[PDB]
Scaffold this active site. Structure first.
Site, PDB file in Angstrom:
ATOM      1  N   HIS A  51      -3.414   5.349  -1.735  1.00  0.00           N
ATOM      2  CA  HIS A  51      -2.735   6.637  -1.804  1.00  0.00           C
ATOM      3  C   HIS A  51      -1.320   6.559  -1.253  1.00  0.00           C
ATOM      4  O   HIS A  51      -0.660   7.588  -1.084  1.00  0.00           O
ATOM      5  CB  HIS A  51      -3.511   7.734  -1.076  1.00  0.00           C
ATOM      6  CG  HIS A  51      -3.659   7.520   0.399  1.00  0.00           C
ATOM      7  ND1 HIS A  51      -2.584   7.520   1.262  1.00  0.00           N
ATOM      8  CD2 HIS A  51      -4.760   7.438   1.178  1.00  0.00           C
ATOM      9  CE1 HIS A  51      -3.009   7.371   2.503  1.00  0.00           C
ATOM     10  NE2 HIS A  51      -4.328   7.332   2.481  1.00  0.00           N
ATOM     11  N   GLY A  63       0.744   8.966   9.432  1.00  0.00           N
ATOM     12  CA  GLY A  63       1.188   7.592   9.391  1.00  0.00           C
ATOM     13  C   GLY A  63       0.192   6.563   9.916  1.00  0.00           C
ATOM     14  O   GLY A  63       0.443   5.360   9.771  1.00  0.00           O
ATOM     15  N   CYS A  75      -2.654   5.877   8.674  1.00  0.00           N
ATOM     16  CA  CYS A  75      -3.379   5.233   7.586  1.00  0.00           C
ATOM     17  C   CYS A  75      -3.018   3.751   7.529  1.00  0.00           C
ATOM     18  O   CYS A  75      -1.917   3.341   7.913  1.00  0.00           O
ATOM     19  CB  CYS A  75      -3.079   5.919   6.245  1.00  0.00           C
ATOM     20  SG  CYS A  75      -3.336   7.749   6.247  1.00  0.00           S
TER      21      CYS A  75
END
Ligand SMILES: *C(=N)c1nn(-c2ccc(C(F)(F)F)cc2)c(=O)n(CCc2ccccn2)c1=O
Ligand SMILES: *C(=N)c1nn(-c2ccc(C(F)(F)F)cc2)c(=O)n(CCc2ccccn2)c1=O
Lengths: 301, 301
Positions: free
Chosen positions: A41, A143, A145
């Site tokens: 993503h 952030g 991820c």
């Protein structure tokens, strides 16, 4: 000595934590050998987050669109690929600091360390557990991820978790390193139903076992109970049902303490029925289910 | 996102963790530049542990008696020295992996990370807090002495703690990196009186502040209270008395939440007087005093 939630040491993983930015979106990647693993993503723009067509978006994006920085080192992408929910960005520079690593899919109940990163720099490390709704409860700001979860037995790093999303419910979901989500979750901005969250009974026993080792023996009742009838108590209080494999893995803990596994199930029966009446085990007024039996032995010996 | 006890990343410290063995005794050291810091009581034999004469014992020991292994690397000692309760074993090989480091003495209330080592290899990392009896509650089995506690702000490692001993009470004591013990403790096998342990009130407020940020706002009472009269409640329940410096350090947390500091002291007054009545903050049925205000902001932003 004592008992605390202890993470594995983080160095072997820090030198694998890079910065990955595609378009306007920045998240962390995992650079092992000549491949930099990160969540799909990353290639989404705000408009596509309801239900993106990932194939189509990847068609549009370019190798030069994919920007990898290892701190102040600047990596350059020579391939791209979608394995389930992760991108594999091949690069020219292989990591000099790649550890002996394996990709493993964990089973519900298992515990691992999380290295929380922002912009490719590690910020902190903490122990998580995979739960029976295949969600984890952790610290993940914007952030984070791409941060990974891992176990280190011997010299080998066993990556099991890449973080992807927070759920509207406040918990966190993610994938193994092959890209498949734990649980029913998808990388869409949809309301997604997490299911009922059952307490890892074998973990709570192992914690109580770690208490007797560390000087807490108030819960120890003179009673006993049966596996079938403990589980009747278990299902009432939404506790994962105990099996003989569970009893067996507690064997080493049973021996050192000299407290049979069924005796502890009986101490756990009263604690569930009569609560704690105001005392504490290991510094908590809650029953703790995020220590595996392995976690206890490694700490208590 | 969420709130968990998070340790600083450990890599910068792992590559400083060596093995130190003198006579029959083995414990961990800290190799920074060309000096390997470790506890004095490495030079003790079982007989001398009541009240050793450290000067006299060091006279007897030889540079060749001091054996330093950095993993499978073999360091060789060219000097020796006693700074308070620590030995400084100068060596020939300087560490290629020495981080930008400072030696700091922490104040009661301050939190740091502990890298637990055995035989020179790191095993795990966990967050501790220095307490007002200058003791720490941690995991320290046999051989964990020499493990260090540290903060990492920016790129700099700020060592504050070397572990030395467990007390008969189950808690742990140790020194700064200059060798002076926190608190009244000595490196003797004596019964040593730890004092009363007062809860870091400013930490508990900061934790509650971190709860409102992370979706827990039940404790928020519509009330208020006065600093003088909150402290009357505080002293009853053995809580460290709040000052204006405390109120000031909570300013940034006060602003983001928009909940005045005295309002939170009033929510804390009822929680102390009426307990929790069976609810939980951030996943605990205890009030948590091992998050500084700094720890909360670093995690919650
Ligand atoms: C983590 N790095 C992160 N992830 N998402 C995110 C994006 C897309 C999905 C999908 F639904 F496609 F699966 C899930 C989760 C984020 O949205 N954000 C927020 C970024 C941000 C930037 C500025 C201000 C606020 N938020 C993430 O950080
Ligand atoms: C930690 N490495 C460690 N420290 N001590 C110890 C030694 C001396 C003191 C003194 F009183 F002098 F300050 C305090 C603490 C230990 O005694 N041990 C135990 C070593 C051991 C070895 C085999 C079996 C059991 N215990 C330590 O590990």
């Amino acid at each position: 000595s004592g008992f605390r939630k202890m993470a594995f040491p983080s160095g072997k993983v820090e030198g694998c934590m890079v910065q990955v930015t595609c378009g306007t979106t920045t998240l962390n990647g995992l650079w092992l050998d000549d491949v930099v693993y990160c969540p799909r993503h990353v290639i989404c723009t705000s408009e596509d987050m309801l239900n993106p067509n990932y194939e189509d978006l990847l068609i549009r994006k370019s190798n030069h669109n994919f920007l990898v920085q290892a701190g102040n080192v600047q990596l350059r992408v020579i391939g791209h690929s979608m394995q389930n929910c992760v991108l594999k960005l091949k690069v020219d520079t292989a990591n000099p600091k790649t550890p002996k690593y394996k990709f493993v899919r964990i089973q519900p109940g298992q515990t691992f360390s999380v290295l929380a990163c922002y912009n490719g720099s590690p910020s902190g490390v903490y122990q998580c557990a995979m739960r029976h709704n295949f969600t984890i409860k952790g610290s993940f700001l914007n952030g984070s991820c791409g941060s990974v979860g891992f176990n280190i037995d011997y010299d080998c790093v066993s990556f099991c978790y890449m973080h992807h999303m927070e759920l509207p419910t406040g918990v966190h979901a993610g994938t193994d390193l092959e890209g498949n989500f734990y649980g029913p979750f998808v990388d869409r901005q949809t309301a997604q139903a997490a299911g009922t969250d059952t307490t890892i009974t074998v973990n709570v026993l192992a914690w109580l076992y770690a208490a007797v080792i560390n000087g807490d023996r108030w819960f120890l009742n003179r009673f006993t109970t049966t596996l079938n009838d403990f589980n009747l108590v278990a299902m009432k209080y939404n506790y994962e049902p105990l099996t003989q494999d569970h009893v067996d893995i507690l064997g080493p803990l049973s021996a050192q303490t000299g407290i049979a596994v069924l005796d502890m199930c009986a101490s756990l029966k009263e604690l569930l029925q009569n609560g704690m009446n105001g005392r504490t085990i290991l510094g908590s007024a809650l029953l703790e289910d995020e220590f595996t039996p392995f976690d206890v032995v490694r700490q208590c010996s």
